[PDB]
Amino acid sequence: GSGEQLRQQGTVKWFNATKGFGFITPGGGGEDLFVHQTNINSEGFRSLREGEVVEFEVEAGPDGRSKAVNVT
């Protein structure tokens, strides 16, 4: 809960909407992780370009698994 800061940052340059699976670049130069679109959708459209940074936090459910959501 409180105290546990989970703020990540990812770029669109390494995003693959067509495939439905992008990537995140936490830190700005190191290891990259895979991300899946679970709760990242709008009501209309999305006008974004490569290079745009996004923000999100890893959430862990009761099952024990964790994933990223609400990537804006």
PDB file of C-alpha atoms in Angstrom:
ATOM      1  CA  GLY A   1       0.000   0.000   0.000  1.00  0.00           C
ATOM      2  CA  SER A   2       1.481   3.291   1.181  1.00  0.00           C
ATOM      3  CA  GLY A   3       5.229   3.646   0.733  1.00  0.00           C
ATOM      4  CA  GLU A   4       5.422   1.307  -2.252  1.00  0.00           C
ATOM      5  CA  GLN A   5       6.103   3.638  -5.180  1.00  0.00           C
ATOM      6  CA  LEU A   6       5.661   1.949  -8.559  1.00  0.00           C
ATOM      7  CA  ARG A   7       6.150   4.592 -11.249  1.00  0.00           C
ATOM      8  CA  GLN A   8       7.413   3.348 -14.615  1.00  0.00           C
ATOM      9  CA  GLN A   9       8.041   5.082 -17.940  1.00  0.00           C
ATOM     10  CA  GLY A  10       7.750   3.773 -21.486  1.00  0.00           C
ATOM     11  CA  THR A  11       8.121   5.135 -25.011  1.00  0.00           C
ATOM     12  CA  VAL A  12       5.850   4.637 -28.020  1.00  0.00           C
ATOM     13  CA  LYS A  13       8.830   4.244 -30.351  1.00  0.00           C
ATOM     14  CA  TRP A  14       8.947   0.638 -29.145  1.00  0.00           C
ATOM     15  CA  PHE A  15       5.184   0.094 -29.226  1.00  0.00           C
ATOM     16  CA  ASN A  16       3.351  -2.363 -31.478  1.00  0.00           C
ATOM     17  CA  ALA A  17      -0.395  -1.705 -31.449  1.00  0.00           C
ATOM     18  CA  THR A  18      -0.962  -3.691 -34.642  1.00  0.00           C
ATOM     19  CA  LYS A  19       0.535  -6.724 -32.903  1.00  0.00           C
ATOM     20  CA  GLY A  20      -1.127  -5.889 -29.598  1.00  0.00           C
ATOM     21  CA  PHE A  21       2.117  -6.103 -27.639  1.00  0.00           C
ATOM     22  CA  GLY A  22       4.531  -3.258 -26.959  1.00  0.00           C
ATOM     23  CA  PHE A  23       7.486  -2.691 -24.644  1.00  0.00           C
ATOM     24  CA  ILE A  24       8.596  -0.414 -21.807  1.00  0.00           C
ATOM     25  CA  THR A  25      11.951   1.300 -21.285  1.00  0.00           C
ATOM     26  CA  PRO A  26      12.244   1.799 -17.503  1.00  0.00           C
ATOM     27  CA  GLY A  27      15.226   3.938 -16.551  1.00  0.00           C
ATOM     28  CA  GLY A  28      16.086   5.196 -20.015  1.00  0.00           C
ATOM     29  CA  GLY A  29      18.861   2.752 -20.820  1.00  0.00           C
ATOM     30  CA  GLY A  30      18.968  -0.819 -19.572  1.00  0.00           C
ATOM     31  CA  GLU A  31      16.549  -3.744 -19.664  1.00  0.00           C
ATOM     32  CA  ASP A  32      13.195  -3.636 -21.455  1.00  0.00           C
ATOM     33  CA  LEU A  33      10.014  -5.460 -20.441  1.00  0.00           C
ATOM     34  CA  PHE A  34       6.939  -6.636 -22.345  1.00  0.00           C
ATOM     35  CA  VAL A  35       3.523  -5.050 -21.817  1.00  0.00           C
ATOM     36  CA  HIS A  36       0.012  -6.125 -22.810  1.00  0.00           C
ATOM     37  CA  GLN A  37      -3.005  -3.910 -23.492  1.00  0.00           C
ATOM     38  CA  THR A  38      -5.506  -4.801 -20.769  1.00  0.00           C
ATOM     39  CA  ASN A  39      -6.963  -1.487 -19.600  1.00  0.00           C
ATOM     40  CA  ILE A  40      -5.302   0.849 -22.099  1.00  0.00           C
ATOM     41  CA  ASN A  41      -8.159   1.983 -24.339  1.00  0.00           C
ATOM     42  CA  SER A  42     -10.166   5.147 -24.995  1.00  0.00           C
ATOM     43  CA  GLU A  43     -13.756   5.874 -26.020  1.00  0.00           C
ATOM     44  CA  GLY A  44     -12.792   7.378 -29.365  1.00  0.00           C
ATOM     45  CA  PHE A  45      -9.348   7.445 -30.961  1.00  0.00           C
ATOM     46  CA  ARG A  46      -5.758   8.067 -29.870  1.00  0.00           C
ATOM     47  CA  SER A  47      -3.465  10.525 -31.650  1.00  0.00           C
ATOM     48  CA  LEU A  48       0.056   9.709 -30.461  1.00  0.00           C
ATOM     49  CA  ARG A  49       3.507   9.593 -32.055  1.00  0.00           C
ATOM     50  CA  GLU A  50       6.700   7.598 -31.515  1.00  0.00           C
ATOM     51  CA  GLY A  51       8.847   8.913 -28.679  1.00  0.00           C
ATOM     52  CA  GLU A  52       5.986   9.940 -26.404  1.00  0.00           C
ATOM     53  CA  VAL A  53       6.556   8.864 -22.799  1.00  0.00           C
ATOM     54  CA  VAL A  54       3.828   7.106 -20.817  1.00  0.00           C
ATOM     55  CA  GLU A  55       3.133   6.520 -17.124  1.00  0.00           C
ATOM     56  CA  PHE A  56       1.717   3.485 -15.322  1.00  0.00           C
ATOM     57  CA  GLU A  57       2.005   1.249 -12.258  1.00  0.00           C
ATOM     58  CA  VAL A  58       2.267  -2.520 -11.820  1.00  0.00           C
ATOM     59  CA  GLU A  59      -0.743  -4.008 -10.034  1.00  0.00           C
ATOM     60  CA  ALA A  60      -0.925  -7.427  -8.378  1.00  0.00           C
ATOM     61  CA  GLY A  61      -4.210  -9.305  -8.149  1.00  0.00           C
ATOM     62  CA  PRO A  62      -5.361 -11.938  -5.632  1.00  0.00           C
ATOM     63  CA  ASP A  63      -4.139 -14.653  -7.999  1.00  0.00           C
ATOM     64  CA  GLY A  64      -0.553 -13.604  -7.359  1.00  0.00           C
ATOM     65  CA  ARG A  65       0.213 -12.420 -10.883  1.00  0.00           C
ATOM     66  CA  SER A  66       1.118  -8.809 -11.672  1.00  0.00           C
ATOM     67  CA  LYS A  67       0.810  -6.591 -14.746  1.00  0.00           C
ATOM     68  CA  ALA A  68       0.763  -2.983 -15.947  1.00  0.00           C
ATOM     69  CA  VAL A  69      -2.451  -1.036 -16.532  1.00  0.00           C
ATOM     70  CA  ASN A  70      -3.750   2.492 -17.107  1.00  0.00           C
ATOM     71  CA  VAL A  71      -0.846   3.453 -19.368  1.00  0.00           C
ATOM     72  CA  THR A  72      -1.169   7.126 -20.296  1.00  0.00           C
TER      73      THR A  72
END
